[PDB]
Design a binder for this molecule. Sequence first.
Ligand SMILES: Nc1nc2c(ncn2[C@@H]2O[C@H](COP(=O)(O)OP(=O)(O)OP(=O)(O)O)[C@@H](O)[C@H]2O)c(=O)[nH]1
Ligand SMILES: Nc1nc2c(ncn2[C@@H]2O[C@H](COP(=O)(O)OP(=O)(O)OP(=O)(O)O)[C@@H](O)[C@H]2O)c(=O)[nH]1
Ligand SMILES: [Mg+2]
Ligand SMILES: [Mg+2]
Lengths: 18, 180, 180, 137, 415
Amino acid sequence: DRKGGSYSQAAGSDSAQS
Amino acid sequence: GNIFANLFKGLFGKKEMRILMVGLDAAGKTTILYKLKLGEIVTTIPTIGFNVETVEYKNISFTVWDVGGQDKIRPLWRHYFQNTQGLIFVVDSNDRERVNEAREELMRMLAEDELRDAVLLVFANKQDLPNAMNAAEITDKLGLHSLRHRNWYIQATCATSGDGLYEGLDWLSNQLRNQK
Amino acid sequence: GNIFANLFKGLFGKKEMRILMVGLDAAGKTTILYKLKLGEIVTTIPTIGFNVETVEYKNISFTVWDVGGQDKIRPLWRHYFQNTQGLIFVVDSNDRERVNEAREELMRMLAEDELRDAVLLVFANKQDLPNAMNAAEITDKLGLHSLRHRNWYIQATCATSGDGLYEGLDWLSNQLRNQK
Amino acid sequence: SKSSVIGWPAVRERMRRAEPAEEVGFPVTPQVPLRPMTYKAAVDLSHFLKEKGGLEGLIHSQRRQDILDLWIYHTQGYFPDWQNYTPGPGVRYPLTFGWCYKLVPVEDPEREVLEWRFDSRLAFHHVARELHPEYFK
Amino acid sequence: SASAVYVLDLKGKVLICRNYRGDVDMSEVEHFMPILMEKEEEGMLSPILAHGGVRFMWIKHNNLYLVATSKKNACVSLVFSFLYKVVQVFSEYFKELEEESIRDNFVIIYELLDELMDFGYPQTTDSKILQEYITQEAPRPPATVTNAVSWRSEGIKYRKNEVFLDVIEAVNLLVSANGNVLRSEIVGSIKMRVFLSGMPELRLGLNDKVLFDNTGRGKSKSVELEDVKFHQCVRLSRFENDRTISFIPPDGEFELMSYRLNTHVKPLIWIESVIEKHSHSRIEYMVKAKSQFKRRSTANNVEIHIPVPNDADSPKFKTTVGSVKWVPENSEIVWSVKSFPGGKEYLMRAHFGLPSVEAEDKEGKPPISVKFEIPYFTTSGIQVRYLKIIEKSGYQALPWVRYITQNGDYQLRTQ
Ligand SMILES: Nc1nc2c(ncn2[C@@H]2O[C@H](COP(=O)(O)OP(=O)(O)OP(=O)(O)O)[C@@H](O)[C@H]2O)c(=O)[nH]1
Ligand SMILES: Nc1nc2c(ncn2[C@@H]2O[C@H](COP(=O)(O)OP(=O)(O)OP(=O)(O)O)[C@@H](O)[C@H]2O)c(=O)[nH]1
Ligand SMILES: [Mg+2]
Ligand SMILES: [Mg+2]
């Protein structure tokens, strides 16, 4: 764990925008 | 599912209930809360922010959140309205000029869709001088009888004497708790 | 934590108590303090500043801080009010003109929020001439019965004779000390 | 997806309860990824909704669409932006390519009654993109 | 266009100086200290000094004044930027900014100063580039500085391609003594610590209001930053053209974007202060803290600083939640709370005496500031859409990002 918010995975781009 | 644990907890008392401390400044709200929690009239500094305390009576812990009647604290009563089940309004029967302000504040508080399930709790504060109104004149001036869909009860309590606090607490418990 | 040392100290006497020496000039305050500490009526110069002394009675060291009744020293009584637990007021029953001034000074001293936990200690000074009032007339003139939330006791003491000082000290100890 | 199957009946019941016409802050689950729904993910969600029912033929409403998007985000983490309808008036194609659900008239564009309809060709034909090339970038 | 940039000391001694143009005599540094002393004693002290026809601009450093004397009408903004770059380079190279490192790395410090700027015009400003050519423990200059890409060094190889982002949120509330918030602005901070192999070109994508409106998806929750500043590696052309945040991520921790817009929402923590201060008798601290944030978010390490009297002594604290400690150095009482869950109501009752003798001069009414910091909270509601990590060789990146919410200029005016 880490203070200030746990790290979360990020996507590559907006898949809904084509 | 099983509710044996819930029944066992409720057999000896599990309900707690809630309460709020709102009203005009110098209306005995802090004194009323101190009498409910401790039982003595202790002079306190003006409530710039808010006072948080809990009172246990009849096996129910009715926590009271004191709210000041200051202009900078009057609009802050909405912050304490969240996660609140009860609300007690302390009227200033000895302040005729501030009576209209207290009535307007009570109407504004009761005119919010968020504060709808909380029954009206009007306490006739300053009920120790001849200038203080009765349990019906104060309610009539504040229009407590016209608060439709709201269980409002007018009770006269003197901060110095402490009489009527038990009756008000019992009325609030009866309004909130509907069990034997 | 352990309080064995405190209990051992209190078993043989640990409480000390406090006292104050205030009043109008030439009201026997210095003479009263000298009688309490030494036990003789010794003539002293006017109290331009203040007198600091301690008196031990009944295993309690009741220190008395003499304060003059001069105009330049009357407003200086607030400096001695800090870190003070008791206050003894010496009235001038033989000074009818100065009786009003002494009453006003006592009312001003008792009308301060800082001096609230100190009980009233009214000593009928100059109780050796026929012009001196009794223990009730002086209190009635000074309005000691109207000092709400204050334990005021009127006692008549003669500086030359010294009678009544023991009774006043016992009353002060009873008011301050509430133990066996 | 057992969780998705379980949430589908509750989501459908909530959408049906809401007619066709209190807490502040933006809490985020710790370690939960957040990304827009993909074309394959949108197609799979549309197929699951069509199979389970409650999505095709239901009266399109802002509250129902918001509830469905919130349920989808809770169940899979997909952003509630791919379930968009094409600009009206008329049948609105899915905003995100691959979506098998679209809104069509059932009778001002706001006062027009819209209903969610399954569209298999939507997942393969970019009708919304063709209609609004500028919106597609 | 400073004539010579030098580093001073707390006693006026110049730790290190390096003339760049030679048009200003080095003896002007001695007169800088008396001028600063005179300005401080009269309230006319300014960072940009003026010694006759030569201006000696100085910056208050950690332990020494970075005095950059100039003679002509040089770019004041350029001089300030050069001083900031030099300070950043010194901080990167030396972990301590004081006299201990000033006189300990003089051999490398002189070389770094010479390489940084020549003739008053800075040339090298990249910390990594400077460290790749000048070290304290020399080869030809790196081609990265000569090449267009001066913020992403090529040839970097790593076992794993992991990037750690940080969604830093600063909640600043300017609440006046009347109870109304005047300045309520929230400044975003998108800082990513990219540590991968090669020089990937990051493709930043978030739920921007402008981007959503352009794409036709302007119906969900989108963050509309009033002011958005891109990083050095971020291409401004793509952002101006179609808001495409495409740039080469740097090697290490760097700030890609920093949102800055006003906030129209209620404060995260509502703090009301009551001052029951008697006339030289006692003081009352009726401090009540209300958590306006969501209950699912907890404000870790919440410290509501309530300024107590300057001469107050023997204070007593009567609170409910959170330890209260009075620091004589700070002359205030801070309502420190380890964990502050949203919706919590903390009430405190301070009581302390005052000296009998009144103060000779007034001390003012400093505003009350809180140090609430609730992580994993997105008050602005802006959610990152995707991060386009593309490399010529081709690799699968695993970027990470965390959202942190803290209190910035959240000062409440005292009564
Ligand atoms: N002495 C006295 N005061 C009373 C009585 N009834 C109501 N009060 C009022 O109760 C107040 C007590 O002050 P607080 O403890 O601060 O409570 P409050 O009335 O809500 O005032 P605030 O906290 O500042 O809003 C006094 O100022 C009085 O005006 C009474 O019978 N006797
Ligand atoms: N002789 C005599 N004097 C008395 C008697 N009762 C009170 N006094 C007064 O006590 C005073 C003694 O003077 P001080 O020792 O200075 O004490 P004080 O009355 O407080 O006077 P100051 O210290 O100046 O305030 C005399 O001036 C008298 O006026 C008494 O019974 N006999
Ligand atoms: Mg109060
Ligand atoms: Mg004397």
